[PDB]
A paper describes a structure:
There are three parts to the flagellar structure: the trans-membrane basal body that functions as the motor, the connecting rod and hook, and the flagellar filament that acts like a helical propeller. Our current understanding of supercoiling in bacterial flagellar filaments, referred to as polymorphic switching, is based upon the notion that protofilaments within the flagellar filament can exist in two discrete states, that differ slightly in length. The “short” state results from a protofilament having a right-handed inclination (the R-state), while the “long” state results from a protofilament having a left-handed inclination (the L-state). To reconstruct filaments at high resolution, all protofilaments must be “locked” into the same state, either L- or R-type, producing straightened filaments that lead to non-motile bacteria.
Numbering used by the authors:
A (entry chain M): 392 to 440
B (entry chain W): 50 to 169, 385 to 440
C (entry chain g): 99 to 147
D (entry chain K): 50 to 147
E (entry chain A): 148 to 169
F (entry chain A), G (entry chain J), H (entry chain V): 5 to 49
I (entry chain A), J (entry chain J), K (entry chain L): 441 to 488
Amino acid sequence: ISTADGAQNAIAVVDNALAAIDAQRADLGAVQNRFKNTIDNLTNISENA
Amino acid sequence: ISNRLSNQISGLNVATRNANDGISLAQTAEGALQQSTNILQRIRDLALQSANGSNSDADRAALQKEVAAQQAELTRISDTTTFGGRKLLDGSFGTTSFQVGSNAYETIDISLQNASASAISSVASVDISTADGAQNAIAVVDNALAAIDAQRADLGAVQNRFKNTIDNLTNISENA
Amino acid sequence: SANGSNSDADRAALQKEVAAQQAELTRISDTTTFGGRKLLDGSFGTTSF
Amino acid sequence: ISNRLSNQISGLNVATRNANDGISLAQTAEGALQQSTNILQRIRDLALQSANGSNSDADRAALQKEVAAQQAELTRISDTTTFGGRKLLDGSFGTTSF
Amino acid sequence: QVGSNAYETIDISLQNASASAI
Amino acid sequence: VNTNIASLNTQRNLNASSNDLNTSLQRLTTGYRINSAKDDAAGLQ
Amino acid sequence: VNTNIASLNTQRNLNASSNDLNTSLQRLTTGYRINSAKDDAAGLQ
Amino acid sequence: VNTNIASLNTQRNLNASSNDLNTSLQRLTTGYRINSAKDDAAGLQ
Amino acid sequence: TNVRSRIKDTDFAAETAALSKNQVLQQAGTAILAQANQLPQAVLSLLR
Amino acid sequence: TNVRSRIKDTDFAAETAALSKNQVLQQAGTAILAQANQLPQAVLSLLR
Amino acid sequence: TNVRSRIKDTDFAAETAALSKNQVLQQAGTAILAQANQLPQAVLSLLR
């Protein structure tokens, strides 16, 4: 960071960059929902079998 | 009369088995469509989250990514229902028949929805990110979601038809 | 359906249930083949015992 | 007498359902008209704020703008009450039966 | 949007500009 | 008399009542008349 | 009858409800609907 | 009965009253009925 | 939520009545079969 | 902070309703299984 | 405001009486059904 010109450009870096973390955490959260729904159908196929 | 009659009784027993297997099959279809239903409700909710003019376009893209995940799940529920290996409702199911008596062609035809993933135009088509797509999306999933439930209606009625059929069936058995 | 608050779309859904039940009436009407000369659908000829 | 009677009982149960749905419908109408009521009270209040001869004509125009906003809200409460998609009270409701 | 149906929304009309246009 | 047609009927009405109880419990667990399709269109639609 | 398919269903709906309670407590401890990914994108993003 | 529609109503009227208190405190801190737009045109204009 | 309540929920005061009924019908039917499966034992009391 | 509040927080008046519901569902399901695991004991009351 | 008070408000000393009454009626009715749903169990004590 130490230079001011790097202080602002830094914020551009971590701004476009931080949202990739959260893009993943989004995806994985959805994948956990996909799991839960999958299981909810799964135990039904189990019971019906 | 006892040979023919006994053969009839046996056919009736086998029909109890087959009708009950049908109830269980249509049960599987019901549950899978409960999950696709909950999903497509969710997709509607995200379209409503996007219609918020204050929700920035970047986060609208994030919503779209969640939607796409949910859509992949619709493709999965669409698959994975392999009762017997000739699975329920994705792609092409051939509108089979379930016999419920002892005579040939004395069956219940059932009409599972040909597809779920791409054909509820498509749910997967929509790509919410733009506001003009947020509202039109709701039109899509509104006319579209009620086809799922039109089926779940039909099949629920078919399960009632099964139960009534069986209730008469065991009477014909007892009378024979 | 006579519930004025029940929307016309859901009235159509009710109608679909009804139609299913009607197909079941056609089935109970059939399927009663005592002897192959079944009971009550179509034309039964008023037999004697 | 048991078949007819049972059919009657079932109809009575369905009637409990339908009447209660009617209570809930008329409830929705009530609430929407609570909000339109509060608004039209408010519009009255602004007319009373305007009758103040000391209130300048420019600020009377400002009051009018608030009123117009409230009027758009009356159009919105008028809409948006889609119970079933055949909504309550705006435009033409056809005097149904329960 | 303030309901559940499409186009059931409140349009809002923020002033296009503040700096040079008041 | 081998068939013993009193038991047979009793078996029937027993399995019917037992289907009704199995469902009744299903209605009590989640506390919903509606848990699947076999109820109705008025159930879900 | 060994399978006893009333209990089986009850076991299911019990474990589902119990997952809902386990999460519900998780929402109450920190006092947040959001505590991890499994909620949503609307949760975090 | 799961829905428990007495609590639901109570939750509503509670959050409405609580909005009224939150604002009421906002009116007391600065000691002004007017602190933002949500009051009125008669408030500010 | 009122409407969905009257559709989708169960009033348990009705349910428990249905349970008590069904339980009585099962315990009954069982105890009935205790007799129906013993009426054929009246046979071999006759001529054996 | 208003926006993040409506996203990330929980209104506890809703939570406690969800708790009361879930607790009833568990205590119920337990007490149900007390019966489901005793219906097979009607068997050996019949023929043993 | 006096008139609107007597119309629109509730005097809570009346309300709490209505509550105590209703609560007693519910807890009662529940505990009653504990018996009404057990009177049919007197059946299978008879002939089973």
